[PDB]
Amino acid sequence: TGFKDFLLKPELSRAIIDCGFEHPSEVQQHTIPQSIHGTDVLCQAKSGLGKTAVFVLSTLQQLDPVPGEVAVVVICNARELAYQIRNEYLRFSKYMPDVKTAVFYGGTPISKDAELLKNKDTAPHIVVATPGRLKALVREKYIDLSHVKNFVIDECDKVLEELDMRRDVQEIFRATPRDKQVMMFSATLSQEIRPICRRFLQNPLEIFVGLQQYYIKLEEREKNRKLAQLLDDLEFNQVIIFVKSTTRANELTKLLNASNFPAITVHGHMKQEERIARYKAFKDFEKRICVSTDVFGRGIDIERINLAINYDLTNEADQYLHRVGRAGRFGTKGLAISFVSSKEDEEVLAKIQERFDVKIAEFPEEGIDPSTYLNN
Amino acid sequence: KQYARHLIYDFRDDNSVISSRLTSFFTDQSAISEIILLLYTLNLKANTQNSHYKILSTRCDEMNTLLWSFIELIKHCLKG
Amino acid sequence: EAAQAKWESKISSDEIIRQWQTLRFLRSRYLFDFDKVNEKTG
Amino acid sequence: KSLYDERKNALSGENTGHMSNRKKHLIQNQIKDILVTGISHQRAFKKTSEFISEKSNVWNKDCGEDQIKIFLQNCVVPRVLFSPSDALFSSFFIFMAFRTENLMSILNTCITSNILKTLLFCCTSSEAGNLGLFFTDVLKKLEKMRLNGDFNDQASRKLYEWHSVITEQVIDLLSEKNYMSIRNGIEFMKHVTSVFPVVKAHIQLVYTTLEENLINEEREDIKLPSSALIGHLKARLKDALELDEFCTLTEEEAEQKRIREMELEEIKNYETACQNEQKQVALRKQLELNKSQRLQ
């Protein structure tokens, strides 16, 4: 347990074993145990490398439970990410019956949320919001910000830049005591915004920053028949199919749903509310097959995918490293299969083996061994 | 005491039927006095093996809280 | 007593992890001396 | 009795409304079930209290120094290194069975005998963590009977003398070899850091030693609790800490106080005005000097 080595409260260190984390990131290594002492922090790090894990564990040790007073304030960028902060604040506090956490965002009636905060059975110690909504609550005497001791600003460069999103974050800072701790984290911190951002902080701490691959040498029309051969030969956990268009991507799942392979579709040219829910069910193990365009090439971490097939091969070596960086996460074995069907395709792999020093060997006619990607 | 196990997530009053069936397979072969003597002996025998330095500070601790965990299953099932 | 018979023989005439396993055996009865009687505690 | 009543305050304060009859049926069944348990636990405590009181009179008729050494190692120490709920027993028994004069003589040979750097070497991560739960409940009972209860000045000199040998034992442990001495001393200092602040000086002794092992070598990722213990050690530096109100026996330490008063009065006008320039050595540099004087 690497997170009991943060020397935390015994109540907080219980659910971390139930949360599965064991190894701290380099961003979490440098700024959390100094934020416990009570000084302000200034952080720059890459996206999705444990930036949100900094401010959840830091604020649950500091809070003293008081009935009916707020103690943690988080201001964010949009309505979607504030629902993600709520789901992680309750997960580390599943074993604390006194604390509570609610979410505020636009589109919801404020007076109906005023009945949520006035009733003590849903009056939390932790309130997270977008400042587009959290400005609207204090101007009618709904909430009081005089008992808060921790302030969190995530994505501090993207919120403070716009002048309309600058006015709402200033009035909450004037409605709270300045004898307080302010936390500020973002992903991209340039040299222009950092003289702007230092107005809220007092003495801050600064932070600035195998896989078996194979390709099939075939002609043009054999690869809609090679699809149903590579599926019924390989023993797969979850498969992703990468199509470089949106016209072929919707003809395939109507072909696959009638071939008794249930599948879904997520890409562009569709509603963003549908893009969240359809990607959620794929993580929920509702179906094992999904097709997608080049939106899902970079950054998505789903560890249950070990078979990634390239229906339409890339022209570069800088997009191909991202699509097969999804399969075989953290030492797991995976597979990368590419359909070579054009003249510019063979030149792509010829620059890959000389750049990445990886030998994309030829597909054997007898098939691969079943014990080289499961046992080995 | 029943509330202190509800907060630490220690479900004993819920699956009391299923836990008694599991010790029924241990008491049919008269294995209960054999397990306690075997976990204690192997833990004490692991004080001479030379494999690593940080490993046997965790292996000795993990086998110690296994023997504590089996004794506590005996007293809940064989009651009387 | 054989561990002290192992001890009294060598005074008449890794190992620090072999010292780690002896000191988990000698903390049963001969605990309150523990200054320099078996080794240098270092 | 207080933890029995607040359980009733949970059910009465949370559930105020109409939801069902069966739910309010089961709660009022339980509000009498705790009170029959509490008075029987009181009667169980009443059965033991006059039993231990009538026993302790013929127990505390003979005090020994070698007769208490075998008790401390064959009856006390293996029930501290066993379990966290069991290590709370070994502190609650000494402060209840033995008398007031017997209590100090037991804790005499436990601390001034340098074995605490030797036990924490040969333990696990959990056995070393249970040893710290012993000295947490010992020093919490000593700090409460010094604040609320009154002592003579000769006894209060002995109480603050125990704190001097506790802090110099753990520092010698942290300056040892690779992993077993260092990792156990962190977890041992995790639980005893609650009732640490007896003297302002002793906090600064144990703080800077974590910096000496921080700069030179980093074998594994043990910088993470080292920065975490530092964030807990300095959090109690500013409450109330001065060794000159309670410890009054100052035959030479008053003189080294009187010299240090004239160095700060000279340097406060040296930072205000500038008439005759004179430089002195700062605090932490001379606070680094007396470490190696005692480390050798």
Side-chain angles (χ1 to χ4, degrees), chain A residues 249-292:
Chain A
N250 199 2
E251 202 147 21
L252 198 55
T253 55
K254 193 158 281 294
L255 175 134
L256 278 182
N257 208 353
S259 193
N260 298 164
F261 290 93
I264 40 182
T265 42
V266 57
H267 41 65
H269 204 276
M270 218 71 81
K271 191 66 64 68
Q272 187 81 355
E273 290 276 66
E274 270 285 299
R275 288 174 65 189
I276 292 299
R278 284 194 158 193
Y279 161 70
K280 178 60 66 203
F282 187 75
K283 204 182 185 204
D284 201 76
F285 214 82
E286 212 84 18
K287 288 159 202 324
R288 295 161 68 118
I289 302 194
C290 201
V291 304
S292 88

Short mmCIF file of all heavy atoms in Angstrom, two decimals, chain A residues 249-292:
data_model
loop_
_atom_site.label_atom_id
_atom_site.label_comp_id
_atom_site.label_asym_id
_atom_site.label_seq_id
_atom_site.Cartn_x
_atom_site.Cartn_y
_atom_site.Cartn_z
N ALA A 249 -18.70 3.11 -41.20
CA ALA A 249 -18.77 2.76 -39.79
C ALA A 249 -20.20 2.43 -39.36
O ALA A 249 -20.41 1.78 -38.33
CB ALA A 249 -18.21 3.90 -38.94
N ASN A 250 -21.20 2.88 -40.12
CA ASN A 250 -22.58 2.61 -39.74
C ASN A 250 -23.14 1.45 -40.55
O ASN A 250 -24.13 0.82 -40.16
CB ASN A 250 -23.43 3.87 -39.91
CG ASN A 250 -24.72 3.82 -39.12
OD1 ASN A 250 -25.00 2.87 -38.40
ND2 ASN A 250 -25.52 4.87 -39.25
N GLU A 251 -22.52 1.14 -41.69
CA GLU A 251 -22.93 -0.03 -42.46
C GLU A 251 -22.42 -1.31 -41.81
O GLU A 251 -22.96 -2.40 -42.06
CB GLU A 251 -22.42 0.09 -43.90
CG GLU A 251 -23.19 -0.76 -44.90
CD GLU A 251 -23.27 -0.13 -46.27
OE1 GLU A 251 -22.43 0.74 -46.59
OE2 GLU A 251 -24.18 -0.50 -47.04
N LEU A 252 -21.40 -1.20 -40.96
CA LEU A 252 -20.76 -2.40 -40.42
C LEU A 252 -21.53 -2.96 -39.24
O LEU A 252 -21.64 -4.18 -39.09
CB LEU A 252 -19.32 -2.08 -40.02
CG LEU A 252 -18.40 -3.28 -39.83
CD1 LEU A 252 -18.39 -4.13 -41.08
CD2 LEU A 252 -17.00 -2.80 -39.51
N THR A 253 -22.09 -2.09 -38.40
CA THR A 253 -22.77 -2.58 -37.20
C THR A 253 -24.15 -3.12 -37.52
O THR A 253 -24.67 -3.97 -36.79
CB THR A 253 -22.84 -1.50 -36.13
OG1 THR A 253 -23.46 -0.33 -36.67
CG2 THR A 253 -21.45 -1.17 -35.64
N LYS A 254 -24.77 -2.64 -38.60
CA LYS A 254 -26.00 -3.27 -39.07
C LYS A 254 -25.70 -4.63 -39.69
O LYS A 254 -26.56 -5.53 -39.70
CB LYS A 254 -26.71 -2.36 -40.06
CG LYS A 254 -28.14 -2.77 -40.40
CD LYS A 254 -28.94 -1.59 -40.93
CE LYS A 254 -29.41 -0.70 -39.80
NZ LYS A 254 -30.39 -1.40 -38.93
N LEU A 255 -24.48 -4.81 -40.19
CA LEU A 255 -24.04 -6.12 -40.66
C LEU A 255 -23.63 -7.01 -39.50
O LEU A 255 -23.77 -8.24 -39.57
CB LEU A 255 -22.89 -5.94 -41.66
CG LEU A 255 -22.13 -7.13 -42.24
CD1 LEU A 255 -21.96 -6.98 -43.74
CD2 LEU A 255 -20.77 -7.25 -41.57
N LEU A 256 -23.13 -6.42 -38.41
CA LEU A 256 -22.66 -7.22 -37.29
C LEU A 256 -23.79 -7.59 -36.34
O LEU A 256 -23.74 -8.65 -35.70
CB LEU A 256 -21.55 -6.47 -36.54
CG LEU A 256 -20.15 -6.57 -37.14
CD1 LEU A 256 -19.15 -5.83 -36.27
CD2 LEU A 256 -19.74 -8.02 -37.31
N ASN A 257 -24.81 -6.74 -36.23
CA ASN A 257 -25.92 -7.04 -35.32
C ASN A 257 -26.80 -8.16 -35.87
O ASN A 257 -27.48 -8.86 -35.11
CB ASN A 257 -26.76 -5.79 -35.08
CG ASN A 257 -27.46 -5.80 -33.73
OD1 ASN A 257 -27.43 -6.80 -33.02
ND2 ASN A 257 -28.08 -4.69 -33.38
N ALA A 258 -26.79 -8.36 -37.19
CA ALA A 258 -27.51 -9.47 -37.78
C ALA A 258 -26.64 -10.72 -37.91
O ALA A 258 -27.16 -11.79 -38.21
CB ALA A 258 -28.08 -9.08 -39.14
N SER A 259 -25.33 -10.59 -37.69
CA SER A 259 -24.42 -11.72 -37.63
C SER A 259 -24.18 -12.19 -36.20
O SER A 259 -23.17 -12.87 -35.94
CB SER A 259 -23.09 -11.37 -38.31
OG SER A 259 -22.32 -12.53 -38.53
N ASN A 260 -25.07 -11.82 -35.28
CA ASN A 260 -25.05 -12.21 -33.86
C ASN A 260 -23.79 -11.74 -33.15
O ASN A 260 -23.24 -12.44 -32.30
CB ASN A 260 -25.25 -13.72 -33.68
CG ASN A 260 -26.60 -14.20 -34.19
OD1 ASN A 260 -26.80 -15.40 -34.39
ND2 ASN A 260 -27.54 -13.28 -34.39
N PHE A 261 -23.32 -10.54 -33.50
CA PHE A 261 -22.31 -9.82 -32.73
C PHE A 261 -22.90 -8.47 -32.36
O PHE A 261 -22.90 -7.54 -33.19
CB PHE A 261 -21.02 -9.64 -33.51
CG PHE A 261 -20.23 -10.90 -33.72
CD1 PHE A 261 -20.40 -11.65 -34.87
CD2 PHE A 261 -19.29 -11.31 -32.80
CE1 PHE A 261 -19.67 -12.81 -35.08
CE2 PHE A 261 -18.56 -12.47 -32.99
CZ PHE A 261 -18.75 -13.21 -34.14
N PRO A 262 -23.45 -8.32 -31.15
CA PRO A 262 -24.03 -7.03 -30.76
C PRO A 262 -22.96 -5.97 -30.58
O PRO A 262 -21.91 -6.21 -29.98
CB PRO A 262 -24.74 -7.35 -29.43
CG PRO A 262 -24.90 -8.84 -29.44
CD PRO A 262 -23.69 -9.35 -30.14
N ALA A 263 -23.23 -4.77 -31.10
CA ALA A 263 -22.23 -3.72 -31.12
C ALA A 263 -22.91 -2.36 -31.01
O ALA A 263 -24.13 -2.24 -31.12
CB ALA A 263 -21.37 -3.78 -32.38
N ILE A 264 -22.08 -1.33 -30.81
CA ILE A 264 -22.52 0.05 -30.68
C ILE A 264 -21.65 0.93 -31.57
O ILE A 264 -20.67 0.47 -32.17
CB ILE A 264 -22.49 0.54 -29.22
CG1 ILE A 264 -21.24 0.02 -28.50
CG2 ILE A 264 -23.77 0.14 -28.50
CD1 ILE A 264 -21.16 0.43 -27.05
N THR A 265 -22.02 2.21 -31.65
CA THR A 265 -21.31 3.17 -32.48
C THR A 265 -21.10 4.46 -31.69
O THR A 265 -22.03 5.01 -31.12
CB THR A 265 -22.10 3.50 -33.75
OG1 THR A 265 -23.49 3.63 -33.43
CG2 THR A 265 -21.94 2.41 -34.79
N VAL A 266 -19.85 4.93 -31.66
CA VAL A 266 -19.54 6.23 -31.07
C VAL A 266 -18.41 6.88 -31.85
O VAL A 266 -17.37 6.25 -32.11
CB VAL A 266 -19.25 6.13 -29.55
CG1 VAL A 266 -18.10 5.15 -29.19
CG2 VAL A 266 -19.00 7.51 -28.94
N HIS A 267 -18.63 8.12 -32.28
CA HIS A 267 -17.73 8.92 -33.11
C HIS A 267 -18.29 10.34 -33.13
O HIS A 267 -19.18 10.68 -32.35
CB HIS A 267 -17.62 8.35 -34.52
CG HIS A 267 -18.92 7.87 -35.09
ND1 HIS A 267 -19.97 8.73 -35.35
CD2 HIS A 267 -19.35 6.64 -35.44
CE1 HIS A 267 -20.99 8.04 -35.83
NE2 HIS A 267 -20.64 6.77 -35.90
N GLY A 268 -17.80 11.15 -34.06
CA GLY A 268 -18.42 12.42 -34.37
C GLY A 268 -19.70 12.24 -35.18
O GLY A 268 -20.22 11.14 -35.37
N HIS A 269 -20.20 13.38 -35.68
CA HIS A 269 -21.47 13.50 -36.40
C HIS A 269 -22.65 12.95 -35.60
O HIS A 269 -23.56 12.33 -36.17
CB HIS A 269 -21.40 12.84 -37.79
CG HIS A 269 -22.39 13.38 -38.78
ND1 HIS A 269 -23.68 12.91 -38.85
CD2 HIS A 269 -22.27 14.32 -39.75
CE1 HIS A 269 -24.33 13.55 -39.82
NE2 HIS A 269 -23.49 14.41 -40.38
N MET A 270 -22.66 13.15 -34.29
CA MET A 270 -23.71 12.66 -33.42
C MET A 270 -23.78 13.53 -32.17
O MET A 270 -22.88 14.33 -31.90
CB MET A 270 -23.48 11.19 -33.03
CG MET A 270 -24.74 10.36 -32.96
SD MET A 270 -25.45 10.05 -34.59
CE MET A 270 -24.43 8.70 -35.17
N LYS A 271 -24.88 13.37 -31.42
CA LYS A 271 -25.11 14.18 -30.23
C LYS A 271 -24.11 13.83 -29.13
O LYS A 271 -23.76 12.67 -28.93
CB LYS A 271 -26.55 13.97 -29.74
CG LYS A 271 -27.01 14.94 -28.66
CD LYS A 271 -27.10 16.35 -29.21
CE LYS A 271 -28.16 16.45 -30.30
NZ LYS A 271 -29.54 16.27 -29.77
N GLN A 272 -23.65 14.87 -28.42
CA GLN A 272 -22.65 14.67 -27.38
C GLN A 272 -23.25 14.01 -26.14
O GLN A 272 -22.53 13.33 -25.39
CB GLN A 272 -22.01 16.02 -27.02
CG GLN A 272 -20.83 15.96 -26.05
CD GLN A 272 -19.51 15.59 -26.71
OE1 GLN A 272 -19.46 15.27 -27.90
NE2 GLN A 272 -18.44 15.61 -25.93
N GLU A 273 -24.56 14.17 -25.92
CA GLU A 273 -25.22 13.44 -24.85
C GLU A 273 -25.27 11.95 -25.15
O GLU A 273 -25.23 11.12 -24.23
CB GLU A 273 -26.63 14.00 -24.63
CG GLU A 273 -26.68 15.40 -24.03
CD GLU A 273 -26.58 15.40 -22.51
OE1 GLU A 273 -25.52 15.02 -21.97
OE2 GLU A 273 -27.57 15.80 -21.85
N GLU A 274 -25.35 11.59 -26.43
CA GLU A 274 -25.30 10.18 -26.81
C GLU A 274 -23.87 9.65 -26.77
O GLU A 274 -23.66 8.45 -26.56
CB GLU A 274 -25.91 9.98 -28.19
CG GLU A 274 -27.40 9.71 -28.19
CD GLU A 274 -27.74 8.30 -27.75
OE1 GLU A 274 -27.30 7.34 -28.42
OE2 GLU A 274 -28.45 8.14 -26.73
N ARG A 275 -22.88 10.52 -26.95
CA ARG A 275 -21.49 10.08 -26.98
C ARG A 275 -20.98 9.74 -25.59
O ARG A 275 -20.01 8.99 -25.43
CB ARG A 275 -20.60 11.14 -27.62
CG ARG A 275 -20.77 11.28 -29.12
CD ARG A 275 -19.96 12.45 -29.65
NE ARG A 275 -18.53 12.25 -29.49
CZ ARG A 275 -17.62 13.19 -29.72
NH1 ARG A 275 -18.01 14.40 -30.12
NH2 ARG A 275 -16.33 12.94 -29.55
N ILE A 276 -21.61 10.29 -24.55
CA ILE A 276 -21.20 9.97 -23.19
C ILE A 276 -21.85 8.66 -22.74
O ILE A 276 -21.19 7.79 -22.17
CB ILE A 276 -21.54 11.14 -22.25
CG1 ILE A 276 -20.66 12.34 -22.58
CG2 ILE A 276 -21.36 10.74 -20.79
CD1 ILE A 276 -19.17 12.08 -22.41
N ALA A 277 -23.15 8.50 -23.02
CA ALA A 277 -23.88 7.33 -22.53
C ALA A 277 -23.48 6.06 -23.27
O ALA A 277 -23.39 4.98 -22.68
CB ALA A 277 -25.38 7.57 -22.65
N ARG A 278 -23.23 6.17 -24.58
CA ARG A 278 -22.83 5.00 -25.35
C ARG A 278 -21.40 4.58 -25.03
O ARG A 278 -21.06 3.40 -25.16
CB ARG A 278 -22.97 5.28 -26.85
CG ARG A 278 -24.41 5.24 -27.36
CD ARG A 278 -24.43 5.17 -28.87
NE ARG A 278 -25.69 4.64 -29.39
CZ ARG A 278 -25.87 4.25 -30.65
NH1 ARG A 278 -24.87 4.33 -31.52
NH2 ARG A 278 -27.04 3.77 -31.04
N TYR A 279 -20.56 5.52 -24.62
CA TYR A 279 -19.20 5.17 -24.21
C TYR A 279 -19.20 4.65 -22.77
O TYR A 279 -18.29 3.92 -22.36
CB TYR A 279 -18.29 6.38 -24.39
CG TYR A 279 -16.98 6.36 -23.63
CD1 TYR A 279 -15.96 5.49 -23.98
CD2 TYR A 279 -16.77 7.23 -22.55
CE1 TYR A 279 -14.77 5.47 -23.28
CE2 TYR A 279 -15.58 7.21 -21.85
CZ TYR A 279 -14.58 6.34 -22.22
OH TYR A 279 -13.40 6.32 -21.52
N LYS A 280 -20.23 5.00 -22.01
CA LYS A 280 -20.34 4.52 -20.64
C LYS A 280 -20.74 3.05 -20.59
O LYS A 280 -20.20 2.28 -19.78
CB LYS A 280 -21.36 5.37 -19.87
CG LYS A 280 -21.59 4.94 -18.43
CD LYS A 280 -20.30 5.00 -17.62
CE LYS A 280 -19.80 6.43 -17.47
NZ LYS A 280 -18.34 6.49 -17.20
N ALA A 281 -21.66 2.64 -21.46
CA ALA A 281 -22.12 1.25 -21.48
C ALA A 281 -21.03 0.31 -21.98
O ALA A 281 -20.99 -0.86 -21.61
CB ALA A 281 -23.38 1.12 -22.34
N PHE A 282 -20.13 0.82 -22.83
CA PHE A 282 -19.00 0.02 -23.26
C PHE A 282 -18.01 -0.21 -22.12
O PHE A 282 -17.32 -1.23 -22.09
CB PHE A 282 -18.31 0.69 -24.45
CG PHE A 282 -17.23 -0.13 -25.07
CD1 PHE A 282 -17.54 -1.21 -25.88
CD2 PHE A 282 -15.90 0.18 -24.86
CE1 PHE A 282 -16.55 -1.97 -26.46
CE2 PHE A 282 -14.90 -0.58 -25.44
CZ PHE A 282 -15.22 -1.65 -26.24
N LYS A 283 -17.92 0.73 -21.18
CA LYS A 283 -17.11 0.52 -19.99
C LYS A 283 -17.85 -0.32 -18.95
O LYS A 283 -17.21 -0.94 -18.09
CB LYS A 283 -16.72 1.87 -19.38
CG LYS A 283 -15.46 1.83 -18.53
CD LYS A 283 -15.17 3.19 -17.93
CE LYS A 283 -13.86 3.20 -17.17
NZ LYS A 283 -13.83 4.25 -16.13
N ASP A 284 -19.18 -0.36 -19.04
CA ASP A 284 -20.03 -1.09 -18.11
C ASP A 284 -20.17 -2.57 -18.49
O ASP A 284 -20.96 -3.29 -17.87
CB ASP A 284 -21.40 -0.41 -18.04
CG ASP A 284 -22.16 -0.73 -16.78
OD1 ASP A 284 -21.81 -0.17 -15.72
OD2 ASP A 284 -23.11 -1.54 -16.84
N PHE A 285 -19.41 -3.01 -19.51
CA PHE A 285 -19.46 -4.36 -20.08
C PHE A 285 -20.86 -4.72 -20.58
O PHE A 285 -21.32 -5.85 -20.44
CB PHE A 285 -18.94 -5.42 -19.11
CG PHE A 285 -18.21 -6.55 -19.77
CD1 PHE A 285 -16.89 -6.42 -20.12
CD2 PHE A 285 -18.86 -7.75 -20.05
CE1 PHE A 285 -16.21 -7.45 -20.73
CE2 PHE A 285 -18.18 -8.78 -20.66
CZ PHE A 285 -16.86 -8.63 -21.00
N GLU A 286 -21.55 -3.75 -21.16
CA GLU A 286 -22.84 -4.03 -21.77
C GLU A 286 -22.70 -4.74 -23.10
O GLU A 286 -23.48 -5.65 -23.40
CB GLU A 286 -23.64 -2.74 -21.96
CG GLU A 286 -25.13 -2.91 -21.84
CD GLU A 286 -25.60 -2.86 -20.41
OE1 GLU A 286 -24.84 -2.37 -19.55
OE2 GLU A 286 -26.73 -3.32 -20.13
N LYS A 287 -21.72 -4.35 -23.91
CA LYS A 287 -21.40 -5.05 -25.15
C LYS A 287 -19.88 -5.11 -25.27
O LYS A 287 -19.17 -4.33 -24.62
CB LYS A 287 -22.01 -4.35 -26.37
CG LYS A 287 -23.52 -4.50 -26.49
CD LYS A 287 -24.11 -3.43 -27.38
CE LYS A 287 -25.59 -3.24 -27.09
NZ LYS A 287 -26.26 -4.53 -26.77
N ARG A 288 -19.39 -6.03 -26.09
CA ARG A 288 -17.95 -6.23 -26.21
C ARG A 288 -17.37 -5.69 -27.51
O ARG A 288 -16.14 -5.71 -27.67
CB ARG A 288 -17.63 -7.72 -26.08
CG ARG A 288 -17.95 -8.31 -24.71
CD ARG A 288 -18.06 -9.82 -24.77
NE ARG A 288 -16.77 -10.45 -25.03
CZ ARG A 288 -16.16 -11.28 -24.19
NH1 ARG A 288 -16.73 -11.59 -23.04
NH2 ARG A 288 -14.99 -11.80 -24.51
N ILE A 289 -18.20 -5.22 -28.44
CA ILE A 289 -17.75 -4.77 -29.75
C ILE A 289 -18.18 -3.32 -29.95
O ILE A 289 -19.34 -2.96 -29.71
CB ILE A 289 -18.33 -5.66 -30.87
CG1 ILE A 289 -17.90 -7.12 -30.66
CG2 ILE A 289 -17.88 -5.16 -32.24
CD1 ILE A 289 -18.11 -8.02 -31.85
N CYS A 290 -17.23 -2.48 -30.37
CA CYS A 290 -17.51 -1.09 -30.72
C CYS A 290 -16.67 -0.70 -31.92
O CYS A 290 -15.51 -1.12 -32.04
CB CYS A 290 -17.22 -0.14 -29.55
SG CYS A 290 -18.06 1.45 -29.65
N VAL A 291 -17.24 0.10 -32.82
CA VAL A 291 -16.52 0.67 -33.95
C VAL A 291 -16.42 2.18 -33.73
O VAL A 291 -17.28 2.77 -33.06
CB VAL A 291 -17.19 0.33 -35.30
CG1 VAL A 291 -17.34 -1.17 -35.46
CG2 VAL A 291 -18.52 1.02 -35.45
N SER A 292 -15.36 2.78 -34.26
CA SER A 292 -15.11 4.19 -34.01
C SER A 292 -14.16 4.74 -35.07
O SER A 292 -13.38 4.01 -35.68
CB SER A 292 -14.51 4.42 -32.62
OG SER A 292 -13.10 4.31 -32.65
#
